[PDB]
C-alpha cells in the first residue's frame, strides 16, 4: 500500500479529495467507508475525513509540515449491515515538499 503525498499549505478549496480507498470485494458488495486515527477521530480531530459511499479520502484543512509531518490512519470497510469486510487498512499520509 502506497503512501499519499500532500503538499503543505495547499490552496484548496477544502475539503479536497486525496485518494480513493478500494477493496477487492467492492464488485460483490456495496461497501461503506470510515476512518480512524490521530488526524480523524483523535487529536488533531477532523483534519481528515472520508466519503462514506465512495471511499474518497478527504483533507479538510491546509497541512503544516512544521506542526505535523506525517499521519498514520486506519480505513474501515463495512457492509450495509455494519459488518466489517476487511482488517483495518493502513493509510500513510506524508506532507511535502
Amino acid at each position, epitope marked *: 500500500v502506497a503512501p499519499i503525498s500532500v503538499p503543505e499549505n495547499g490552496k484548496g478549496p477544502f475539503p479536497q479529495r486525496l485518494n480513493q480507498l478500494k477493496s*477487492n470485494k467492492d*464488485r*460483490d*458488495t456495496k461497501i461503506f467507508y470510515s476512518i480512524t486515527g490521530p488526524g480523524a477521530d483523535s487529536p488533531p480531530e477532523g483534519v481528515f475525513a472520508v466519503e462514506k459511499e465512495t471511499g474518497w479520502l478527504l483533507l479538510n484543512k491546509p497541512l503544516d509540515r512544521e506542526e505535523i509531518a506525517k499521519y498514520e490512519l486506519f480505513g474501515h470497510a463495512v*457492509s450495509e449491515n455494519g*459488518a*466489517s*469486510v476487511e482488517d483495518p487498512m493502513n493509510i500513510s499520509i506524508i506532507v511535502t515538499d
Partner: single-chain antibody
Amino acid sequence: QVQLQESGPELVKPGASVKMSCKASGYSFTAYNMHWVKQSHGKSLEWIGFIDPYSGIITYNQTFKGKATLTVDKSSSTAYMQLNSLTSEDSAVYYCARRGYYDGGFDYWGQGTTLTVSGGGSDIDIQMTQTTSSLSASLGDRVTISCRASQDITNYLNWYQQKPDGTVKLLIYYTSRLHSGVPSRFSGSGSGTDYSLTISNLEQEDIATYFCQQDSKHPRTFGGGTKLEI
C-alpha cells in the same frame, strides 16, 4: 502460489444432499470473496453465488436459492457448498473461484468437482452471447473471439480460458487488463455492449475454450463459450 484444491468426484442418488470442499492456500483466506459456478456437460457456465469469508455475507443467484448452501471454515481455509434435493439436472462439474480485483474478474479457480446424480426470481439476467461456438484456425495465426451483452456493461467484461482438462484460467479482466503470467499475445478490447479477445501467434497451448463473463450486475453471467481447435 495461489491454489484452490477441490474435493473428489461425487456419485449420489436422487433426493440426497452432497457437500463439496474448496481448500485455499497461498494467500489470506478471509481477504478475498469466494465464488462458485456450475458447468453442465459440455460447456455452459452458470454463476451460483459467493461468500465473504470475513463477514459471512452470502449472495445467491436467484436460480440457486434453496438448492445451494455456502459456508466457510475460517480455521482450515476451506469453503463449502452443499447441494440439496438432488436431481439429474444437478449433474455437473462445479467450481471454486476467487474474486481477484476491485474491477472484477475471478483470478484463480479450483480444478472442479464432478457431481453425477443417477429456483429463479425477478432479477433481470444479462445475456452474454458468443456468436461463434466453434472456431478452427492454424498455428501461428491471429484470431478474434467475440462477446455481446444484452445491456451496456461499462467495460466490466472478463475472459477465461478452459483447457480440455477442466482447468480454468483468467486471461483478461475489466475489458483489457491482463492477469499476471498471461502472455502479451492475449489482448482484449470493447466498450458498452460489444467486446472481443484477440490471441496472436497461436500455440499448441491455446487449444481451449474461451468464455466471456460480465461483472456489471448480479447475477454474474457468462457467454456460451467459443471452442478453439489447432
